[PDB]
Design a protein around this ligand. Structure first.
Ligand SMILES: CCCCCCCCCCCCC/C=C/[C@@H](O)[C@@H](CO[C@@H]1O[C@H](CO)[C@@H](O[C@@H]2O[C@H](CO)[C@H](O)[C@H](O[C@]3(C(=O)O)C[C@H](O)[C@@H](NC(C)=O)[C@H]([C@H](O)[C@@H](CO)O[C@]4(C(=O)O)C[C@H](O)[C@@H](NC(C)=O)[C@H]([C@@H](O)[C@@H](O)CO)O4)O3)[C@H]2O)[C@H](O)[C@H]1O)NC(=O)CCCCCCCCCCCCCCCCC
Ligand SMILES: CCCCCCCCCCCCCCCCC(=O)OC[C@@H](O)CO
Ligand SMILES: *[C@@H]1O[C@H](CO)[C@@H](O)[C@H](O)[C@H]1NC(C)=O
Ligand SMILES: O=S(=O)([O-])CC[NH2+]C1CCCCC1
Lengths: 279, 100
């Protein structure tokens, strides 16, 4: 399918001098990079995080990011010290690209101000977001005309360098991105939904890739009352899921929990509710 | 304008709560904004020192999410919880870890 690579930046401007910045790089949902803010360097979280880019290339991308951080902070604190009332505030930047089915790339550069969409880089121009009015239009006017050279750099980063690096990363980490990790399932009893009523819980943890199918079933008829939880993260790149169901005490025998996952190579996981039926 | 989103706290173990075997306790704190949050893993009330967390990240709505996790050996005498404090919380919110 489609695969993306993103660089996220989170800036918190507290007062006219202090301003913290965080940044990280993500291949889909896997963090591949961090940013050490003291040294201002890229932290390569995997052996293959270099992604077929030379040390001279990555060293210059570091220099670029350091200067971008310097200038961006400089200009925002310049405009913001004009009204100390705004402090504190937050700016979030999600940049990067996405390869579509067929190899067509599409680049993103989106900016949010205080958790609300501020502006975007659509096609080749800065488009302000509907919602933020004055600030979105002012930042767009400054970007579309004054801070030029920044626009051309954004275009070439998200449209040229980002897809090359993404494919370099995908090739460098082929054995980790294409990995398949089998889940472990187990049954348990949650809190009673009512007197006489019984709560069955099915846990499926430690599986990668993320897509998974979990259901409570009576043979082949899957129960429709089962409540699927959220697919939550584990450390070391696995996922967790919880499927619950409340049933009449007496109708619980015969029910089972079925788990389908790509790693199970066909033979699915089936766990029958036993309760206190086995001596 | 500014949006403020209350954090969503979910506590779950990596493996079944095999009472006596090593395991990992995970507190997933998602969907909050702004970014400044205070997350602590508590064993019987006191804060656990050896705790680790993912790098800060945000979803598509720009709301942040973190994964705090610690290695632990569960015992019948111990209770575990996750306590987060955010601007959208008057008093710190504590979610205890159910055996399940
Ligand atoms: C890649 C590299 C770069 C790429 C992109 C770069 C960035 C992109 C765009 C960036 C932002 C552009 C958008 C901006 C829009 C604007 O529209 C701008 C300003 O709008 C209007 O401006 C007015 C300014 O007047 C405000 O009115 C003031 O409100 C205040 C309430 O707090 C007070 O009421 C004040 O009254 C007084 C008062 O009493 O203080 C009266 C006094 O008489 C007067 N004293 C005088 C005259 O001497 C004093 C005076 O005004 C101030 C300021 O001039 O002077 C100083 C002074 O010298 O004393 C200056 C000094 O520097 C400062 N001390 C320090 C250390 O700095 C000092 C100090 O005292 C205070 O700090 C603390 O006390 O104050 O103010 C009012 O004036 C008004 O509120 C406001 O709406 N709106 C903004 O939101 C600012 C921007 C912040 C948010 C933006 C950040 C996100 C945007 C970017 C996204 C990232 C980039 C996108 C892409 C990335 C790269 C491609
Ligand atoms: C700035 C727009 C970037 C658009 C895509 C760039 C092309 C990708 C190639 C870069 C190789 C590795 C870069 C990712 C790691 C660096 C990082 O985590 O940086 C965040 C920092 O700067 C926030 O303080
Ligand atoms: C500005 O922010 C930093 C970070 O909180 C703090 O150390 C500094 O003292 C602040 N200045 C104030 C609150 O006057
Ligand atoms: O397998 S994987 O997609 O590489 C898992 C990524 N782990 C992160 C998910 C979001 C919370 C922080 C940890």
């Amino acid at each position: 399918e489609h695969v993306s690579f993103h660089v996220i930046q989170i800036f918190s401007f507290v007062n006219q001098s202090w301003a913290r910045g965080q940044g990280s790089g993500w291949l889909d949902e896997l963090q591949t990079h961090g940013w050490d803010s003291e040294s201002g360097t890229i932290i390569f979280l995997h052996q293959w995080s270099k992604g077929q880019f030379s040390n001279e290339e990555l060293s210059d991308l570091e220099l670029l990011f350091r200067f971008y951080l310097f200038g961006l902070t400089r200009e925002i604190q310049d405009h913001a010290s004009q009204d100390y009332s705004k402090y504190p505030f937050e700016v979030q930047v999600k940049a990067g690209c996405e390869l579509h089915s067929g190899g067509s790339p599409e680049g993103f550069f989106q900016v949010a101000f205080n958790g609300l969409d501020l502006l975007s880089f659509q096609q080749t121009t800065w488009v302000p977001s509907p919602g933020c009015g004055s600030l979105a239009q002012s930042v767009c006017h400054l970007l579309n005309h004054q801070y030029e050279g920044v626009t051309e750099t954004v275009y070439n980063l998200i449209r040229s360098t980002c897809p090359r690096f993404l494919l370099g990363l995908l090739d460098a980490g082929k054995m980790y991105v294409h990995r398949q990790v089998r889940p472990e399932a187990w049954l348990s009893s949650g809190p009673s939904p009512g007197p006489g009523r019984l709560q069955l819980v099915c846990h499926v943890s430690g599986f990668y890739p993320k897509p998974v199918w979990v259901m409570w079933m009576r043979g082949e008829q899957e129960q429709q009352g089962t409540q699927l939880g959220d697919i939550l993260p584990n450390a070391n790149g696995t996922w967790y899921l919880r499927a619950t169901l409340d049933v009449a005490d007496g109708e619980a025998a015969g029910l089972s929990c079925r788990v389908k996952h790509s790693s199970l190579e066909g033979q699915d996981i089936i766990l029958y509710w036993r309760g206190s039926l086995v001596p | 304008a500014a949006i403020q989103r209350t954090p969503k706290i979910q506590v779950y173990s990596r493996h079944p709560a095999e009472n006596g075997k090593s395991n990992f306790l995970n507190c997933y704190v998602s969907g909050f904004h702004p970014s400044d949050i205070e997350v602590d893993l508590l064993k019987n009330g006191e804060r656990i020192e050896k705790v680790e967390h993912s790098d800060l990240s945000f979803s598509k709505d720009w709301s942040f999410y973190l994964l705090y996790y610690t290695e632990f050996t569960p015992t019948e005498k111990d209770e575990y919880a996750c306590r987060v404090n955010h601007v959208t919380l008057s008093q710190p919110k504590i979610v205890k870890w159910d055996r399940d």
